[model samples]
Target: APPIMGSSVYITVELAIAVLAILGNVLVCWAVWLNSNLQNVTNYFVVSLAAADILVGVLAIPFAITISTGFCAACHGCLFIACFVLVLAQSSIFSLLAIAIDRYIAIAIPLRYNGLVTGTRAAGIIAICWVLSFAIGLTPMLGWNNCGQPKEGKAHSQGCGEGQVACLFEDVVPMNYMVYFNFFACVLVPLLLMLGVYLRIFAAARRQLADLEDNWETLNDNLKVIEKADNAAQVKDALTKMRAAALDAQKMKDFRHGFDILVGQIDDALKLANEGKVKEAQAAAEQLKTTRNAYIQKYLERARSTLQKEVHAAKSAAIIAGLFALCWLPLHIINCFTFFCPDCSHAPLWLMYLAIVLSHTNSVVNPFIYAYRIREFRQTFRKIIRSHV
Candidate 1:
């Protein structure tokens, strides 16, 4: 996949990209880790995807530089590195698919998403994605390979024969596995599923927004409309009921913030106690009551809530689907070209290299997508930037 400008230019560029991929992905993991509010089922998959992107930097792109750094001593060494590179790449795709699935479940079964699909289960799903990627990546070793089957004596790394023992990817990995299994089965299948999932989310969200608006139009001013009620005294019954529901939801949300802070305070106190500051630690334990009142006073009017948003969520869904196609489609198309059109028409080496670059660009682009398109990630990312500046 080296270009006409030769291997060094490609190496220099890949090095630059790998650095950013590692830096940006590592920042997100830190962003989520430092904030309890940021840790959720959804962000778990975001972090998983970021983890894969980090591997792209730490492993895959370097492996992609086959011409520059590889002198594979044996056939299996070449196969293993090539397979490992793909194991990392497909994990990115699967994690992304998991995001869409998680997002969809959050919307479709909101209560269930919170209660049933808890933290331990989310951890299990991530493990499944990693396990599946390795199985798919190593499928070439299961007999569908280009190794040791060169017609006569022409060897370019595709076949392991008499002396030309270089580790070119084109030399060993078969195009059949790349196009049929990897591209068609692994890459495109997840993308199409995600596309369907996101659109469903977007439409469902927009409909919810519209339904909310309809309720608002009928009751523009609560006091104003309630006064017009034929049994004005009876109107008190519904408003009071609505009040309870609204208050409970917000109170629970606020309670989560308080509970999280108090639990961490215990940990802080425990650390101090273990350090032999027993008196200070006991004071810290007693300090929760003071903290609770301070929080309660701050929340005197906090029961009142404001409308936040769903259009942004809808927009995010649309954007991910679009970018998914933009970044991934070309590489698969190029994959199919080699497989389906074997006769005369062929993609040049540089175009294949370009497609490879575009696909890896998917890895780098995701951190920015989370930064700009997703609000929680954006807010945390802003805090990260301001901390430095």
Candidate 2:
């Protein structure tokens, strides 16, 4: 019950890992819970991740030691550990991915991020993650195991050293099925989604940066041309000095440029209006309202207050995803190899130990990442530390 009373060194390390995972996740969840300001769409995902990490410490890690010690029997205990671990681990990974997608939307489409990821929408996403986790996590116990099937049992039983049934029980599901299912669904899908989202975010940022540079260049060129045209117009009269006609022409040209960029094919709207098509013209005029709003809101008032904040947040999001990838990729790779290698004997003890430790360390280190990279989180953490002191 208590880790076989012999593997003292391994038990000590496991205990330390459990302690770190619990305390770190507890602090993360506590900070979000206490600070109402921290309760937003983004931090909602963070809280979910913290909850999953806490469960990993509270349930997954402790029972892992029990199973390893051979105290827990093969069928029921192993099944429970496998299902629970998968559910909690998958929940954490999906929550991290949701955070990545949230950051991408905030940075790439700042104007719409607020409307897009509403409170209800965030809750829906959390619900989906847990639902999928449970559905996939329980697949083994839900008739995918190798209890009666000898081939499946042999496929999964090759690496049964150290009584690590839960470790290899995932392979019990048909290799033909679980190879693609577990590998893709659990590991590859989340990894690719995060990688794709972050890459698109960076590309969008570069495009936005280039667009801003081009706008400034165009504005400077327009000023020089206006100054040249006004040189002759300046001498005509008081109103002429104001370059009334020239200014009017430029404003007309600016409006046209805005129109072309905002609407690709509006010739029908123009033609109907020009041919005295009164009813249709009125409808076209109504359609033009959206173009006008886009020009004014997105380009004209382009220096929105949230630009810098979104950029900073995108950087932080990239760092968070990067950390997750670095910590988890090794473990995922090992698992993949284990799945494919038919002759694979037991994995080296150190390798197994390191992979589990590194993966769990991801939970421990995320709070520090938040504190260091996010100003608001840092300030809030400071307040938390001081109040307790």
* Leading candidate by lDDT: 1
Superposed model 1: Cα runs more than 4 Å off: 1-5, 67-73, 150-165, 216-308, 385-389
Counted clashes in each candidate structure: 2, 0
The alpha-carbon deviation from the true structure for residue 122 of candidate 1, after best TM-score superposition, in angstroms, is 0.6
Native-to-model Cα distance after best TM-score fit, residue 248 in candidate 1, in Å: 17
**Alpha-carbon deviation at 68 in model 2, angstroms:** 1.2
lDDT of 1 by residue, 1-389 (tens): 43446567666777888898898998889899987888987778778878988988888888787644445336556777777867876877777677777777766666677787788888998999899888898888777766666323434444546644566676678888888788888888878888888788777766655545544333234324334444423344334433343334332565667545655654565566456554565555555456456553344323211112444554564465467568778877876777788885778766766777776777787778778877788888889889974
Clashing pairs in 1: 157-171, 158-171
Report how far off residue 2 is in candidate 1 (Å).
12
Count residue pairs with overlapping backbones in model 1.
2
Taking all chains together, the TM-score of candidate 2 against the true structure is: 0.72
For residue 136, what is the lDDT in candidate 1?
Answer: 92
TM-score of model 1 vs. true structure: 0.71
